Write an enzyme that holds these catalytic residues in place. Structure first.
Site, short mmCIF file in Angstrom:
data_model
loop_
_atom_site.label_atom_id
_atom_site.label_comp_id
_atom_site.label_asym_id
_atom_site.label_seq_id
_atom_site.Cartn_x
_atom_site.Cartn_y
_atom_site.Cartn_z
CG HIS A 16 -1.94 -1.10 1.22
ND1 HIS A 16 -3.28 -0.89 0.99
CD2 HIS A 16 -1.79 -2.43 1.41
CE1 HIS A 16 -3.92 -2.05 1.05
NE2 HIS A 16 -3.03 -3.00 1.30
CG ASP A 104 -5.33 1.75 1.78
OD1 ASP A 104 -6.27 0.93 1.68
OD2 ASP A 104 -4.13 1.43 1.59
#
Ligand SMILES: O=c1ccn([C@@H]2O[C@H](COP(=O)(O)OP(=O)(O)O)[C@@H](O)[C@H]2O)c(=O)[nH]1
Ligand SMILES: O=C(CCc1ccc(O)cc1)c1c(O)cc(O)cc1O
Length: 447
Positions: A16, A104
């Protein structure tokens, strides 16, 4: 002169952080003032090292920190999601005036109200494949049934790159009721319509059908626009020299690079079957080993992890190189001596292989890794054995692994289709490609 101020909030894991920082570099090269929010403490040391090198390369990034009160990465997913709704004071007091917000995909539910109150166009960054996002989008409909989860042998989303997703390719946690991943999927996916758009590290060259189906409404009617801002090109700050020099002495397209990501460790006896199958293949290899999930807690050495039997066979060849460290994977894939990639099919390393035109031997292990595999298998530039199942459910012997490696290495049909993907990945970033067209659209709205 005014400014386009973009705030970014990544989650735990290099899978990520790396795509977010590459996205930040693309925006910084588009003259955007970037605010980066990093929850502390970072789970891994690679996340620690990458941020320190990124902000050393881009000191104009307004970095903001804040502290926090199963799997270590899946736990910090919650400590960011559950604990810190107190992220608003960091976002609502930003100067210069904020222009957008990208957070995210794993933080949709708590950050959506924060983003809506900021009064700026807010988006998510989906680090996995667009086909995986279509699964994430289509999930509330197939879970709505009373047949879920016991009676669901195939997931079929209209028009996506993988038309028929069998039950074998569905992430195991989602099939169990009251699962933490099931709770997140049901809580986030309905909130997708509140977003101003979805950013996916992908391009038309690999997932042409999934992008047309999502943006065509054929998945879920009313989904926000899905912008294929891939392929995320690896930047220079990501690099941290034995491996550099060992690859220079190997023939081009002869080294099989093997890495299962940053947050996955194989079982000890299943891990030793890999090295058994590596030497049983007669090919040169560069194998990255992980004994633990987090790189900090690497206790035992490689001699004890691989065993005295396999260690004796490794050094007898000098044909391959085995390391238990963090390597510059993009520097390895870009080397001309690498021709094969045995990958867990994490989407970052998949798009990276697509960026360097390296054919893939898919060995999915957990989660979305099986869906990303057949996405590659549909493209014709990769193979993956479906019967190998998930990690822990099966002991893939060294004979099958050796065959599967020798099968991929001498198959020029994949290379002929692997470079075609590499050609489309370059057109995606040039003038008129899917990424540059999508970036200029979002840029003009943020003013
Ligand atoms: O030794 C390593 C292991 C991983 N990576 C990078 O870390 C990411 C791995 O994320 P992915 O989604 O592929 O798998 P995950 O780690 O999330 O399971 C990719 O960008 C890899 O290039 C790297 O540079 N060196
Ligand atoms: O299926 C996914 C998608 C991740 C995801 C989590 C939360 C969310 O809201 C959206 C997507 C998945 C897992 O299940 C388990 C993994 O080890 C990795 C992985 O990529």
């Amino acid at each position: 002169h005014p400014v386009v101020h973009v705030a970014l909030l990544p989650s735990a894991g290099m899978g990520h952080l790396t795509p977010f920082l590459r996205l930040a570099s693309l925006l910084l090269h588009q003259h955007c003032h970037v605010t980066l929010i990093t929850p502390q403490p970072t789970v891994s040391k690679a996340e620690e090292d990458l941020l320190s090198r990124f902000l050393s390369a881009f000191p104009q990034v307004n970095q903001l920190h804040f502290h926090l009160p199963t799997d270590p990465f899946f736990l910090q997913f919650a400590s960011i999601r559950s604990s810190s709704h107190l992220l608003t004071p960091l976002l609502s007091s930003l100067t210069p005036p904020l222009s957008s917000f990208i957070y995210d995909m794993t933080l949709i539910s708590p950050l959506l109200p924060i983003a809506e109150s900021l009064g700026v166009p807010h988006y998510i960054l989906f680090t996995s494949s667009a086909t995986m996002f279509s699964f994430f989008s289509y999930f509330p409909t197939l879970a709505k049934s009373e047949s879920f989860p016991g009676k669901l042998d195939f997931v079929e989303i209209p028009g996506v790159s993988v038309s028929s997703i069998p039950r074998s390719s569905i992430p195991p946690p989602l099939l169990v009721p009251n699962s933490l991943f099931g709770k997140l999927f049901m809580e986030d996916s309905p909130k997708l319509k509140k977003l101003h758009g979805v950013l996916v590290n992908t391009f038309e060259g690999i997932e042409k059908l999934s992008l047309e189906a999502l943006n065509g409404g054929k998945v879920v009617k009313g989904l926000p626009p899905v912008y294929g801002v891939g392929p995320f090109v690896p930047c220079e700050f990501e690099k941290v020299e034995t491996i550099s020099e060992w690859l220079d002495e190997q023939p081009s397209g002869s080294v099989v690079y093997v890495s299962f990501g940053s947050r996955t460790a194989m079982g000890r006896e299943q891990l030793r079957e890999v090295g058994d199958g590596l030497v049983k293949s007669g090919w040169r290899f560069l194998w990255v080993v992980k004994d633990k999930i987090v790189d900090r807690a690497e206790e035992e050495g490689l001699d004890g992890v691989l065993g005295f039997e396999l260690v004796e066979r490794m050094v007898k060849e000098k044909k391959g190189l085995v390391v238990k460290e963090w390597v510059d994977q993009s520097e390895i894939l870009g080397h001309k001596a690498v021709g094969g990639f045995v990958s867990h099919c994490g989407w970052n390393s998949v798009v990276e292989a697509a960026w360097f035109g390296v054919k893939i031997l898919g060995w999915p292990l957990h989660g979305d890794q099986k869906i990303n595999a057949e996405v590659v298998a549909k493209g014709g530039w990769g193979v993956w054995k479906e019967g190998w199942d998930w990690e822990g459910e099966r002991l893939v012997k060294g004979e099958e692994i050796g065959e599967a490696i020798r099968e991929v290495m001498n198959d020029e049909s994949l290379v002929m289709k692997a470079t075609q993907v590499k050609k489309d990945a370059r057109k995606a970033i040039s003038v008129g490609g899917g990424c540059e067209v999508a970036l200029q659209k979002l840029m003009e709205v943020w003013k």
